[PDB]
Amino acid sequence: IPHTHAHLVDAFQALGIRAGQALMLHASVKAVGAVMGGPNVILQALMDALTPDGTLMMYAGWQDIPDFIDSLPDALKAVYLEQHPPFDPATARAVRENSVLAEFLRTWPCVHRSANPEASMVAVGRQAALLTANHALDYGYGVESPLAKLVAIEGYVLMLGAPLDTITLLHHAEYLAKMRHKNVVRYPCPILRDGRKVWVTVEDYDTGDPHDDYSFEQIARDYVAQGGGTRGKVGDADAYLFAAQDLTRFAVQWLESRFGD
Amino acid sequence: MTDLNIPHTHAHLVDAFQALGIRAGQALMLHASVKAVGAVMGGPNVILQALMDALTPDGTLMMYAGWQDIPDFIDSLPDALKAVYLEQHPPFDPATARAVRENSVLAEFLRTWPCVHRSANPEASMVAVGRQAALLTANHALDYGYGVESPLAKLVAIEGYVLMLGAPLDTITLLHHAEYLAKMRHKNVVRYPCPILRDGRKVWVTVEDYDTGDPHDDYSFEQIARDYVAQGGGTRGKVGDADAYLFAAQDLTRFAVQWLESRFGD
Ligand SMILES: CN[C@H]1C[C@@H](N)[C@H](O)[C@@H](O[C@@H]2O[C@@H](CO)[C@H](O[C@H]3O[C@@H](CN)[C@@H](O)[C@H](O)[C@@H]3N)[C@H]2O)[C@@H]1O[C@H]1O[C@H](CN)[C@@H](O)[C@H](O)[C@@H]1N
Ligand SMILES: [Cl-]
Ligand SMILES: [Cl-]
Ligand SMILES: [Cl-]
């Protein structure tokens, strides 16, 4: 008895999903268990609960981003600079980890994808263009980003069996928080400009390691423990539903009270 | 979005600990987030009381304390300021030194308990109550505080357990003992100053240890533990509102050492 479309819709609504919401999804397709019609039915079920007036977004990134070329032998780097393809939002594949549904969402009609290669987001639904447009290359989790806009339209984050450590929105809280010190990274990336490949330097806060003695798992568990969000079962997966505005405010205060200057 | 609970009772915490697998006479190291458990009838001390009730007086309960105010950073200060720290900063006083800032409410509660014992190493300080509290905390060397002369080594040797109570597995102090034990291609060795009490007087000493602030290679503690649970390490169960985990110290240490050595070892 694999989970049916209807069964998942009702579990989404029991958790708190409602028509018209803008939401960002993090999922582990494995944790949900078998679904009748396969993993795409998870998305169809979710968009059914959201209705066409709602919006669904996921983090895609770019699996093949060649941001490591400086650590290669000079001779190999030269080959990358000539032969590695640029970020193409039409065909660039999503990061491997917890992303089967993101790759699925990229074949949906009317999908939008933001232009920042490393921080690329995909979205479908009413506010999909708004969320994804004019995504700055530098500080791609900052003020000119789909995360900033998700907070601004009072959207949500849904964890569908995905670990609390993987909440991309918390990088936006890192961006906002006034902290003693934040690590800056500067790395190369080929992109399309007027149809032609150009390599640029991208500047960003480091998102590979926390800027201080904390983890996102820590912050999220502290949030849930003080009453943040709702928790519930969806298929076989443990699910959480958070308000983006409230989570971001909580996380910024959390970081500023422990690591401010 | 989720309302607070009707307070958990002592009795219902004892039951939950027994259902998790806590048994009389065990020696336990506890990692807890008090808020994860939810409201408790009587406050956070009842968690400790219920756990010791599950363990009986024949059991032992240990937690990591450390020293929140350790002035181990004073070599990175300008000369004049460093001189002020050297003259004015208090020494580590086991009686009053406060535990590190996070997940330590219960460790701080443990320090007001009668018959509590505190190990002597300031940065790696452990607190314990119960039958083997003295044995576990005895003769904790100042150098290599997570090594052979540590409460963690003794916890493994007497085949104790580690109990997660809503704390991230990231924070299992025992994993620093695994780092000590593992033969790895690269290790960071640090020397830092610390004021202690010798014969009632403040004296500054230099402590030598492995760096425990950064990993010695490309890994994180969350990696190792998540890999440990994924392959069936320990038992799981609810305690109050918290998701709990119960590990055998010996098994987790062996796993984490093999984990490190297979990736970075000889
Ligand atoms: C041993 N003295 C210093 C030696 C020096 N070589 C270290 O760099 C320095 O560590 C920095 O401070 C850590 C805070 O943990 C950061 O590590 C974190 O960084 C994240 C992401 N980057 C993860 O890598 C990792 O999980 C860590 N949580 C490090 O950048 C040490 O001091 C600290 O560690 C002492 C012992 N525990 C404490 O007593 C001190 O109060 C002080 N916090
Ligand atoms: Cl997945
Ligand atoms: Cl997110
Ligand atoms: Cl705590």
Curated annotation (Swiss-Prot), chain B:
The keyword Transferase applies. One of its GO terms (biological process) is acetyl-CoA catabolic process. It is an enzyme of class 2 (transferase). Keywords: Acyltransferase, Antibiotic resistance, Transferase. CoA binds at H31, A32, S33, V34, K35, S104, V105, F109, T171, T173. A 2-deoxystreptamine antibiotic binds at Y64, D72, E102, E123, Y146, D170, H176, T212, G213, F221. It catalyses: a 2-deoxystreptamine antibiotic + acetyl-CoA = an N(3)-acetyl-2-deoxystreptamine antibiotic + CoA + H(+). The keyword Acyltransferase applies. Changing E123F: Loss of catalytic activity with gentamicin as substrate. It holds the Pfam family Antibiotic_NAT. Changing Y64F: No effect in catalytic activity with gentamicin as substrate. InterPro entries: Amioglycoside_AcTrfase, Antibiotic_NAT-like. Homodimer. Belongs to the antibiotic N-acetyltransferase family. Resistance to antibiotics containing the 2-deoxy-streptamine ring including dibekacin, gentamicin, kanamycin, sisomicin, tobramycin and neomycin, but not to amikacin or netilmicin. Acetylates a broad range of both 4,5- and 4,6-disubstituted aminoglycosides, including neomycin, paromomycin, ribostamycin, sisomicin, gentamicin, tobramycin and kanamycin, with no preference of one disubstitution over the other. Acetylates sisomicin and kanamycin most and least efficiently, respectively. Does not modify plazomicin. NCBIfam families: AAC_3 (NF033082). This is Aminoglycoside N(3)-acetyltransferase III. It comes from Pseudomonas aeruginosa. The lineage of its organism: Bacteria, Pseudomonadati, Pseudomonadota, Gammaproteobacteria, Pseudomonadales. The gene is aacC3.
